[PDB]
Design a protein around this ligand. Structure first.
Ligand SMILES: O=c1ccn(-c2cccc(C(F)(F)F)c2)nc1-c1ccnn1-c1ccccc1F
Ligand SMILES: [Mg+2]
Ligand SMILES: [Zn+2]
Length: 311
């Protein structure tokens, strides 16, 4: 009987795809719990275990410009919006597991790509050949679940528990952008040839993978002032990695070179054309109520074209 409520403006705004969670860090746990309750009921988690899990997850996010606690909660909110707009499509286990996956998808990120770990010869690159950081994020998730008082899935049978951790694992692995290209191409073809079947677990996994990409890229679907300021954080990370590449004696790609800041607007165009528009396009074909994400993405592309033309 202990509901969560948000002030009127947030209560209304949080149902929308383009919601910004605000600068008050101390409200984000309350926002997450609010979203879990409206997404799978007040019963599905023990409130004292859930709060303990959230604070341990927060502790294990680092103070990096972009891949921080704020990103985690932004990505979870976008999944909440997708689940609330496609209510009857997903199971009780998928709903429970996917919000947790989004909150944990970047645990212990230091602000470096898999590519820099490979070139630095980091121990995580020996432990994990592909999806280095994403296999690490899932390891960290399992660690926090195994702390005393943190098992939020305590009332799930052994079958259910293994199912929910396999959803979480695949959801987190899918946030490796290198895997997105193949996954989206295969979903496009299954849709065009009419073979896509949401009763096939194999096709379901691909669809959840695309949802995870969409949630992870969702900064490109905000209102222009939020999109434009988040790009400052994204490039702060990229340029830091560029600097570390130069210390290994490797020329960074231009995107990561802080000496080529002039090329940013043209580079965003590339990304919107090559990644973001194709992602939300294919997602809207499979889940029509996610149209607003595609609309907002197109809006922001047109804003970057105005920046290139000095408007
Ligand atoms: O603004 C952006 C410009 C470039 N890239 C980007 C990133 C990786 C590979 C590539 C590739 F080389 F594949 F093109 C492009 N991404 C963004 C961007 C927008 C939102 N999130 N996000 C983003 C940030 C960090 C890591 C992954 C991301 F996805
Ligand atoms: Mg990641
Ligand atoms: Zn992420």
């Amino acid at each position: 009987l202990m509901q969560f409520t948000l002030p009127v403006r947030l209560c209304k705004e949080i149902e929308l795809f383009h919601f910004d969670i605000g600068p008050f860090e101390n409200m984000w746990p309350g926002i997450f719990v609010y979203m879990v309750h409206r997404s799978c009921g007040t019963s599905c988690f023990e409130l004292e275990k859930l709060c303990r899990f959230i604070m341990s997850v927060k502790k294990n996010y680092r103070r990096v410009p972009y891949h921080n606690w704020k990103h985690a909660v932004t990505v979870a909110h976008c999944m909440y919006a997708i689940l609330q707009n496609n209510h009857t499509l997903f199971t009780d286990l998928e709903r429970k597991g996917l919000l947790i996956a989004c909150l944990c998808h970047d645990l212990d990120h230091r602000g470096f790509s898999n590519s820099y770990l490979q070139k630095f010869d980091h121990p995580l690159a020996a432990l994990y050949s592909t999806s280095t950081m994403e296999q690490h994020h899932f390891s960290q998730t399992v660690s926090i679940l195994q702390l005393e008082g943190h098992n939020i899935f305590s009332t799930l049978s052994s079958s259910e528990y293994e199912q929910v951790l396999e959803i979480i694992r695949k959801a987190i692995i899918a946030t490796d952008l290198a895997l997105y290209f193949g996954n989206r191409k295969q979903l496009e073809e299954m849709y065009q040839t009419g073979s896509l079947n949401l009763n096939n677990q194999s096709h379901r996994d691909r669809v959840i993978g695309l949802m995870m990409t969409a949630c992870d890229l969702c900064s490109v679907t905000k209102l222009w002032p939020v999109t434009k300021l988040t790009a400052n954080d994204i490039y702060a990370e990229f340029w830091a990695e560029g600097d570390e590449m130069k210390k290994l004696g490797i020329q960074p790609i231009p995107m990561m070179d802080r000496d080529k800041k002039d090329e940013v607007p043209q580079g965003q165009l590339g990304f919107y054309n090559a990644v973001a528009i194709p992602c939300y396009t294919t997602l809207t074909q499979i889940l029509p109520p996610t149209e607003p994400l595609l609309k907002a993405c197109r809006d922001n592309l047109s804003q970057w074209e105005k920046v290139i033309r000095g408007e």
